[model samples]
Target: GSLPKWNQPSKEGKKITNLFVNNSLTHSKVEFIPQEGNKIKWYACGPTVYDAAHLGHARTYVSFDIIRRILVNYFKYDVFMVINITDIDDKIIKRSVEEKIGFTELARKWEYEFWEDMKSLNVLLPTAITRVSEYVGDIVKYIEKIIENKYAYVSEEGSVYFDIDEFKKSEKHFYARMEPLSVKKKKNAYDFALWKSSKPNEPHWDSPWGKGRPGWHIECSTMASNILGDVLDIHSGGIDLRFPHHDNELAQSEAFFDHSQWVNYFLHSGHLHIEGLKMSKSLKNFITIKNMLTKYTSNQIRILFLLNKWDNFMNYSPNGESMVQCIEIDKSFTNFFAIILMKIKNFDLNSCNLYWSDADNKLNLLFRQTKNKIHEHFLDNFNTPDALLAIQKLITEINIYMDKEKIQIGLLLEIKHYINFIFDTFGLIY
Candidate 1:
């Protein structure tokens, strides 16, 4: 059966969003399964965790967090999510040397700090967070398979490179099919590294191929396989990975195993630009996720990030209207929350669910509408920004209705269901 589709609003009335399944979707979106009792498992590429998380980092997690929230709370799917922490990587090694810190200590410090920022942003913790440094053996075994399968060759320096050329001839190869054009330029379109031999200035673990570390993409592939298995239903990250990063992951992973589809769908969130300029590591014009924590509250920061489509670029200028509006919207939502929560607690919900009895069903229509709209929004492409807009629209309506209705019990209950629904899918709960 085809995945179920719900009616959605037209563009004029619709919220603008971009969804990318294998690349990027410029429409509102959702993930649905027509198969009854279908389950959802998500794998998010978490931060490197060697340095403080930047706003770009928060943008990624918070974006995915909302998706998780909606899937669970509204759709009621059993969702299992794994977020990977790159505790040891080339960048980590460089940063470590510069800071004169122990590798483990560096990971611990940054990982913990990142957690603090995530929690503050209402981003739920992943069901499992597998750190790369801890998964060296699994990494080795996976790489070994790649080597034995003849999908890869070990370089003179012990780095394992996937044989993209040969795999290009394989039939079942729609995998990593959407990687940016540049990687396709390799002699073999699918070739990428599975293992990176350690350099003098990097971290090392005993491996089949001498002392070395995993490649950036290899960390995720091995981690996902170790935790999830042969194939991933949906793999996601920032759009930045589409070109080299994600493309490489796809090429190397499938080229290595060739035993399965590996990843079924791909999703990439929008980039965070600052002041019309790219918020870049190279330029050093950025805000650490933790840094933003010190300024705007989590809700405000999230709202600001979502102002643009998840796949669209966002410009965050210190003096922009968004920053100012966020402060206002945040105050309004939080302040309303304090008072409405009190009113809501005292409101009667005892007569809520009975259909025949004199129960409150006034908000039933609202709940249904919210659910249908949310479903449709995501179905179109994982239209996150617009999906979030729908949520915000509901939240706005609920506020108005509750205030006008003088503590609407039915409406509040409906709102509560939707709130939990959105949170379950996206991990934003206030």
Candidate 2:
């Protein structure tokens, strides 16, 4: 698919100075690169709509949304984002059976709910949102390529499995996540299902293997490659998917495309924990996005994410530490704005001039240093937490300077510019 044209990439101030990539194959941080020109092709593993989206979903998507915004609004990269909806997964099938509803009906109901929650969080719409069931033919063709290339085989149970051992022969370090394999009758224990033989009550599509459904891992590989093409600039998901899900995807996709570096960057968000345990419905400790929205505005929830490192595990509890930090941040930003408003009222624009001398004060000197620190933090692998801390320091200094009884219009104007740019870069205020 052709990319939708947007504003051209910036040639001036907005540039991606440095970005960190968790290259799962190398198991180290690598510099992120654009595959083609200035355009970035990004693929994120989206929701599997068997149930309501949870707080974990909120954190993952919101985190990536910030990355996307930073790349566009801060770094000035024109990014084409493709997200896949796994609408025909095992959970969806089980839920359909229990509810006595069609699988598509159940998927649609929850998918709608997912988008509703996403919209409330102010996440930008993806360039393309592909559905698994909508592209069964493409998935079959993709699997055929892998099979024709000797990377996959049909099993005796009418299932198709990707040949991980065969892939390892051609490629080293192919075993991503490097976890112990699942025990199944295959040439290797790690060989995973590409297609499963249809069950009685489950959905099915016609292929060379008769009636079957695409496996969990193959669905992402098929849709991502089909929609975004090969050599995506960024591939992202929750850290939990780094195991079999992303690993199998990397295996099958690179196996089919015959490319060593099919993805330029791999980004994963850390898990969101509630009450010191992972937030999952299976544990019954989960908070739904709907539930979170009831108590907090979207920006407040956003603040909860902004105060911490994006790639670290965030603990969420009722009136817990994260909550306390977010509340304090809210008050801090509120106080800064109030101080800014009060300072602006007393300033005289015509007579004030900026002087960077140690003669009267080093307010301008401190402002430039703090501004550079904010930029440095953001440019260093998008360390937003550090950038926010720098911004807080700037805010504190401005509040003290304004109380000096001699308000310099030059410094006040500079302060407004600093605050606006900091907030704009972080997607916090602008």
Candidate 3:
């Protein structure tokens, strides 16, 4: 079957009027207005593809995926999303050497696994997927432009580093806009590499500076600029990248284009911790997406995320409070959906003509109010927690009404359709 056209224009028109997003660059909630009419160019940072993806990776991608769905499926925007895969990086080289395998082989293996995990989690596919290895020539050209612009310089070691001081000399440029204090702390900090000099037994790309690989930060800047153009509507990634990674990306791109803002909105997903502790391989608390899926369904995992704010740090408790709450929420929605389907199947068409009672009137009013509330919640920085809570509260009221003898089939069907619309929009429906 063909993949769904997620960017297809909505027939019903845009629902949300004023959508606000917490942009990391400005460190404030700003109204999201696309540069072009109803079209958004979004760039989300993909994984490094050296090892198995963990819950941390899942949280970032799934959270962004939910936001993307809200944009396309809810707000009716044509989002042209570009996600870059870091197939050639320091991590890939190190892992390949340790495993005694070809770097390309290792990268392809994990990159495939990453996409499979994303598919399993029901994350929508990006409009375009750019690989760092495939765009080495473009990156070289990009770095050349930065060097020509005097924002970057070639070092004696045959490595190209972004000149933070020279970049800051320009009134339009700032070294670290996302975290200004870090720049102050490290006044004489080392310039970040735009291109790394080639090392023996490591993957190398031919550049003007010599045989080398693109820096971690330059890869994104080059890829995003090449694909999404000079400016992006939204650039999203995990919160951990807010520092050198994202900031460097911003500097390089803006320096290359000579534009003040390369990205309008910087959206960062919160970090995910396991059992109140930071998840790490050394700590033996690491949980991979593959292993986690063996225990819980994707819907349950998504519900856990939905119950919390997308941009807030979340704790994934192992059989603890959060998981228990998500499981309960899942069960409630499942049962409610089943009962609604059964009622819809058996309801008499002639009974639809019956007059609505006080219970029916109240539930209908609540349904309308709940929809407005959900719209507001989504508008407020894609507040999934409150939106899901609103749905749950409406479901609880509907459950009470379901127990009544005088059932209004018209109202029930309307409520059921609205619930299904929400579930489908949220990707909760299997």
TM-score comparison, 1 vs 3, better candidate: 3
Ranking by TM-score: 3, 2, 1
Worst 10 residues of 2 by lDDT: 1-10
Highest TM-score scorer: 3
Segments in model 2 whose C-alpha atoms lie over 4 Å from true places: 1-16, 171-173, 177-185, 345-361
- Each prediction's RMSD over C-alphas, in Å, is 7.2, 5.8, 6.4
TM-scores of the models, in the order given: 0.79, 0.88, 0.93
Residue 426, candidate 3: alpha-carbon lDDT: 82
Off by over 4 Å in 1: 1-37, 174-176, 184-191, 338-375, 382-430
* Order of candidate numbers by lDDT, starting with the best: 3, 2, 1
Write one digit per residue (lDDT tens) for candidate 3, span 140-248: 9999999999888777778888888888878777678787776522224658889999998778988888999888999999999998998798999988798889988
User: lDDT values of the candidates?
Assistant: 0.67, 0.78, 0.85
Could you say which candidate leads in lDDT?
3
- lDDT-wise, the better of 1 and 2 is 2
- Per-residue lDDT tens digits for candidate 1, residues 303-356, read 776666666677777754668977775666566567668767876567543243
